[PDB]
DNA sequence: CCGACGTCGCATCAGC
DNA sequence: GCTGATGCGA
DNA sequence: GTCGG
């Protein structure tokens with residue numbers, strides 16, 4: 245990409261602030277700056293040019309000038325050399341180990357993959373499965389494999405109840421040629437914002453996907469959100485496919501458009517869009533868009549009959565999913 | 571200057 | 587057990 | 597770290 249050096253640098257800084265500094269707003273600020281620079285259609289020649297972009301301020305402008313002149317960032321070099329930052333940044337790559345747990349592990353001398361494997365009993369269940377599949381979860385999924393995973397999920401869901409509709413969102417819905425994982429939005433007419441007239445609606449689907457050995461592990465599971473692991477079947481004598489992260493979100497059927505807007509993302513696009521809603525006097529979650537009174541308190545949900553209706557309320561032109569990869 | 575920064579599900583824990 | 591952080595994840 | 601009142 246045109247400015248990959250800069251955006252990689254800002255991403256590394258974002259990860260440092262989140263994992264080591266535990267500064268969530270600095271993390272979001274760095275990621276916002278990297279996103280807006282990543283879609284900028286010119287090769288950036290100076291910090292001043294970058295600072296014209298929203299989300300890029302004086303401090304990042306200076307870092308961009310350092311990076312353009314030398315090819316590196318001293319602040320990052322020194323972070324790379326720091327053993328505590330390095331260990332913390334590694335441990336947070338395990339699903340379920342966040343900033344707090346990583347600093348606690350390092351305090352107890354648990355700082356390497358070998359250390360984690362030695363101390364499996366010091367891990368909660370999520371962390372245990374994240375360590376089990378640590379290698380696999382850093383692999384990406386070719387769209388071709390996403391299409392085979394789609395086929396299984398949709399056909400197994402149809403076998404449980406033909407009135408389910410499963411929609412693959414995430415980067416897949418944005419048309420990406422590869423995805424980090426699989427995101428499945430699920431609806432059923434028995435579950436609306438007005439009533440839940442059938443229990444176990446998410447459970448039954450998970451059960452069936454476990455039955456056919458597609459779902460292999462569970463990280464967390466409640467009435468509307470499953471977070472787990474899945475794997476495509478491989479042919480005779482073939483090496484197995486990597487295990488993959490899968491997230492399933494059951495959304496009230498009448499709130500599908502807010503739900504599919506949310507689960508299609510990207511995460512940065514969602515933040516930017518919801519922040520624009522707030523400036524426009526609305527609040528958007530995965531269920532509703534609601535107005536804000538002078539109070540500052542959310543009012544009643546507005547009528548939504550398409551993704552575009554949500555864009556219309558906040559005075560944004562519609563953006564197809566493929567144009568939301570911020 | 572400085573308050574706001576997206577929103578929420580599930581797991582875990584502390585306090586009652 | 588419940589309720590309200592807090593952690594970690596989407 | 598950046599932005600907007």
Ligand SMILES: Nc1ccn([C@H]2C[C@H](O)[C@@H](COP(=O)(O)OP(=O)(O)C(F)(F)P(=O)(O)O)O2)c(=O)n1
Nearest residue numbers: 414415423424425427506507508509510511514596
């Ligand atoms: N902090 C977040 C994370 C995710 N999300 C939403 C948007 C996002 O697209 C959806 C799925 O989360 P993923 O982490 O799987 O992101 P993704 O868009 O599918 C992706 F591109 F990162 P992936 O292909 O690597 O999974 O959940 C969000 O709103 N806020």
Ligand SMILES: Nc1ccn([C@H]2C[C@H](O)[C@@H](COP(=O)(O)O)O2)c(=O)n1
Nearest residue numbers: 408409410411429430431432497500
């Ligand atoms: N998972 C899904 C996907 C679509 N739908 C419904 C919402 C709309 O009535 C209709 C839109 O179809 P589509 O947007 O996929 O062309 O399907 C649903 O209820 N659950």
Ligand SMILES: [Cl-]
Nearest residue numbers: 529531532545
């Ligand atoms: Cl709501």
Ligand SMILES: [Mg+2]
Nearest residue numbers: 414415425427
């Ligand atoms: Mg995804």
Ligand SMILES: [Mg+2]
Nearest residue numbers: 574575599600
């Ligand atoms: Mg603001």
Ligand code: NA
Nearest residue numbers: 295296297300
């Ligand atoms: Na700027």
Ligand code: NA
Nearest residue numbers: 336338340341
């Ligand atoms: Na992690």
Ligand code: NA
Nearest residue numbers: 425426427491
């Ligand atoms: Na996901």
